[PDB]
Design an enzyme around this catalytic site. Structure first.
Site, PDB file in Angstrom:
ATOM      1  N   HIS A 102     -49.022  -1.031 -15.889  1.00 16.42           N
ATOM      2  CA  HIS A 102     -48.844  -1.967 -15.601  1.00 16.42           C
ATOM      3  C   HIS A 102     -47.546  -2.750 -16.005  1.00 16.42           C
ATOM      4  O   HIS A 102     -46.515  -2.862 -15.896  1.00 16.42           O
ATOM      5  CB  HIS A 102     -49.874  -3.383 -14.808  1.00 16.42           C
ATOM      6  CG  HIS A 102     -49.154  -4.347 -13.923  1.00 16.42           C
ATOM      7  ND1 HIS A 102     -49.100  -5.349 -14.449  1.00 16.42           N
ATOM      8  CD2 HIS A 102     -48.450  -4.011 -12.950  1.00 16.42           C
ATOM      9  CE1 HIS A 102     -48.537  -6.200 -13.287  1.00 16.42           C
ATOM     10  NE2 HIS A 102     -48.271  -5.007 -12.296  1.00 16.42           N
ATOM     11  N   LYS A 104     -44.549  -3.110 -18.276  1.00 20.47           N
ATOM     12  CA  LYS A 104     -42.841  -2.862 -17.931  1.00 20.47           C
ATOM     13  C   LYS A 104     -41.494  -2.820 -19.150  1.00 20.47           C
ATOM     14  O   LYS A 104     -41.714  -4.153 -19.889  1.00 20.47           O
ATOM     15  CB  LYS A 104     -42.435  -3.495 -16.627  1.00 20.47           C
ATOM     16  CG  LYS A 104     -42.631  -3.863 -15.248  1.00 20.47           C
ATOM     17  CD  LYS A 104     -44.377  -4.395 -14.835  1.00 20.47           C
ATOM     18  CE  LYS A 104     -44.030  -4.112 -13.734  1.00 20.47           C
ATOM     19  NZ  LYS A 104     -45.050  -2.512 -13.048  1.00 20.47           N
ATOM     20  N   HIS A 326     -41.704 -11.759  -8.359  1.00 20.15           N
ATOM     21  CA  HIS A 326     -42.291 -10.895  -8.984  1.00 20.15           C
ATOM     22  C   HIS A 326     -42.642 -10.273 -10.393  1.00 20.15           C
ATOM     23  O   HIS A 326     -43.251 -10.330 -10.987  1.00 20.15           O
ATOM     24  CB  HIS A 326     -41.854  -8.982  -8.939  1.00 20.15           C
ATOM     25  CG  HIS A 326     -42.589  -8.225  -8.047  1.00 20.15           C
ATOM     26  ND1 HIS A 326     -42.747  -7.172 -10.134  1.00 20.15           N
ATOM     27  CD2 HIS A 326     -43.356  -7.751  -8.388  1.00 20.15           C
ATOM     28  CE1 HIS A 326     -43.314  -6.465 -10.311  1.00 20.15           C
ATOM     29  NE2 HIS A 326     -44.611  -6.502  -9.240  1.00 20.15           N
ATOM     30  N   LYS A 328     -44.720 -12.322 -13.464  1.00 20.74           N
ATOM     31  CA  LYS A 328     -45.792 -13.856 -14.011  1.00 20.74           C
ATOM     32  C   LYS A 328     -44.989 -13.977 -15.068  1.00 20.74           C
ATOM     33  O   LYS A 328     -44.974 -13.824 -16.004  1.00 20.74           O
ATOM     34  CB  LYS A 328     -46.567 -12.168 -13.982  1.00 20.74           C
ATOM     35  CG  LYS A 328     -46.389 -11.238 -13.501  1.00 20.74           C
ATOM     36  CD  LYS A 328     -45.824 -10.337 -13.310  1.00 20.74           C
ATOM     37  CE  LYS A 328     -46.038  -8.791 -13.118  1.00 20.74           C
ATOM     38  NZ  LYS A 328     -45.868  -8.760 -11.400  1.00 20.74           N
TER      39      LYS A 328
HETATM   40  O1  LIG Z   1     -45.525  -4.195  -9.417  1.00 17.96           O
HETATM   41  C1  LIG Z   1     -46.871  -3.553 -10.349  1.00 17.96           C
HETATM   42  O2  LIG Z   1     -46.345  -3.060 -10.932  1.00 17.96           O
HETATM   43  C2  LIG Z   1     -48.004  -3.836  -9.498  1.00 17.96           C
HETATM   44  C3  LIG Z   1     -49.033  -2.492  -8.945  1.00 17.96           C
HETATM   45  C4  LIG Z   1     -49.965  -2.911  -8.381  1.00 17.96           C
HETATM   46  C5  LIG Z   1     -50.505  -4.330  -8.437  1.00 17.96           C
HETATM   47  F1  LIG Z   1     -51.545  -4.117  -7.056  1.00 17.96           F
HETATM   48  C6  LIG Z   1     -49.283  -5.536  -8.328  1.00 17.96           C
HETATM   49  C7  LIG Z   1     -48.382  -4.950  -8.723  1.00 17.96           C
HETATM   50  C8  LIG Z   1     -47.891  -6.580  -9.054  1.00 17.96           C
HETATM   51  O3  LIG Z   1     -46.920  -6.285  -9.619  1.00 17.96           O
HETATM   52  O4  LIG Z   1     -47.426  -7.204  -8.093  1.00 17.96           O
END
Ligand SMILES: O=C(O)c1ccc(F)cc1C(=O)O
Length: 436
Positions: A102, A104, A326, A328
């Site tokens: 996940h 970034k 988007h 967090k």
């Molecule tokens: O965008 C992302 O990397 C992502 C990937 C899978 C998920 F279940 C949720 C998210 C999110 O961050 O909303």
């Protein structure tokens, strides 16, 4: 700005609300450095789009894509990249079930130094178009002279902590980036790294990752104040995992307990910010914004107790109430929301996979995913607290919180956005319904 915390540009807001925002093309511009090589850590990639975001003169420099895809998804990503001979791929190992890569992050190696960018956006057009997303930009880190022996370390231990995060991948392409980082001076870094990597962590390693990492930093580098029980916790996210049959299973027992830690020596209010159906319907994108707000009906129906914690998305301070989040973020405001004890921007959503769940009678923290964020602590800036900036783009020691405080509770008719059920009662800003 000591903080170097930015929002992405939003198409459709007045220029005043993009003055000081960054698009990906700005980040990769020659004004930021003369690119030699880059690494792009992410979840989702549109490779054709991504290459076009680099300046034409830099489009043939080596790019490493760090991803978590397997099987057919991995084959699809390789097929996207194959036309570009300068693109290499690194598949991050996900050896625990239901994990995600996940994180970034951009690593940008220049002729002049190195930059690290930790952010919240996927590398696709929609994530940089009309969403609220967050970016932390490191300073330009100079190279340590050949033959000179110095640590290049910051008071927040960021250099060693970033190397530790990369070492967890056990990947040859990332060892090359570890060696690059070793050669640079990261001492000006004023943020703490908070990462998650997959594993089962015991003993000393339990404090390295996830919510126990946050707890350790707050114990060691924050101080408790009188009436700390009145300082709320705020969490703000784009996705919700399965948290259990009641709040005692994880949300209030370990997650909230870590987030309320201050110093070395519960009634604390918990506010969770997550878009309502109405927030999505009336957004700039309309219902399609909900494609990036993954919360499934199968999960939501097992935890209706959670929704009484939910507050609407509102961001008048940054002109972004209609730009769905988007980003967090997590933070610890004072009872009147005028100050904060700390602020975190991260990839981590409201998920056990991301933050970790205790196992083995509380002796082991199990994490399924890779996540990464940066923590702003007043002590790292010579301060006891941060004032909240009243208008996001309007003394520089005030922290730019990108949404409105206090958060507003859902109304009785509001419902959390759930992405895989239909909404056919009222049309969106483009005239459409939502039929998954
Ligand atoms: O965008 C992302 O990397 C992502 C990937 C899978 C998920 F279940 C949720 C998210 C999110 O961050 O909303």
């Amino acid at each position: 700005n000591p903080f170097q915390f930015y929002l992405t540009r939003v198409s459709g807001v007045k220029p005043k609300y993009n003055s000081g925002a960054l698009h990906i093309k700005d980040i990769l511009s020659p004004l930021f450095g003369t690119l030699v090589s880059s690494a792009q850590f992410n979840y989702c990639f549109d490779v054709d789009w991504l290459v076009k975001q680099y300046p034409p003169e830099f489009r043939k420099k080596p790019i490493l894509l760090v991803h978590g895809d397997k099987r057919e998804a991995k084959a699809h990503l390789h097929a996207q990249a194959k036309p570009y001979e300068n693109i290499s791929l690194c598949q991050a190992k996900l050896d625990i079930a239901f994990g995600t890569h996940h994180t970034k992050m951009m690593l940008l190696l220049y002729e002049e130094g190195l930059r690290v960018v930790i952010h919240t956006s996927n590398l696709i057009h929609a994530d940089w178009h009309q969403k609220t997303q967050g970016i932390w930009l490191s300073p330009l880190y100079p190279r340590i002279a050949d033959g000179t022996h110095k640590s290049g370390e910051s008071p927040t231990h960021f250099k060693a902590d970033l190397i530790s995060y990369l070492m967890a991948y056990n990947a040859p392409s990332l060892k090359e980036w570890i060696d690059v980082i070793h050669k640079h001076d990261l001492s000006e870094t004023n943020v703490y790294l908070i990462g998650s990597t997959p594993g089962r962590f015991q003993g000393s390693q339990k404090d390295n990752w996830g919510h126990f990492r946050l707890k350790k930093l707050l114990k060691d580098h924050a101080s408790s104040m009188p009436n700390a029980e009145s300082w709320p916790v705020v969490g703000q996210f784009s996705s919700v995992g399965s948290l259990g049959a009641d709040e005692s299973k994880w949300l209030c027992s370990e997650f909230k307990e870590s987030m309320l830690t201050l110093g070395k020596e519960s009634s604390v209010p918990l506010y969770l910010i997550y878009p309502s159906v109405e927030n999505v319907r009336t957004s700039l994108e309309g219902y399609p914004a909900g494609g990036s707000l993954p919360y499934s009906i199968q999960t939501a129906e097992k935890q209706n107790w959670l929704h009484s914690y939910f507050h609407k998305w509102s961001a008048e301070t940054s002109g972004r109430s209609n730009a769905m989040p988007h980003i967090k973020t997590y933070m610890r405001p004072s009872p009147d929301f005028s100050k904060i004890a700390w602020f975190l921007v991260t990839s981590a959503n409201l998920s056990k996979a991301a933050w970790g769940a205790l196992e083995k009678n509380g002796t082991q923290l199990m994490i399924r995913s890779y996540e990464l964020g940066v923590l702003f602590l007043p002590s790292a800036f010579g301060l006891d607290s941060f004032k909240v900036k009243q208008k996001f783009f309007a003394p520089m020691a005030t922290f730019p919180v990108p949404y409105d405080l206090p958060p507003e509770l859902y109304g009785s008719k509001d419902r959390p956005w759930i992405w895989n059920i239909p909404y056919v009662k009222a049309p969106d800003t483009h005239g459409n319904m939502w039929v998954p």
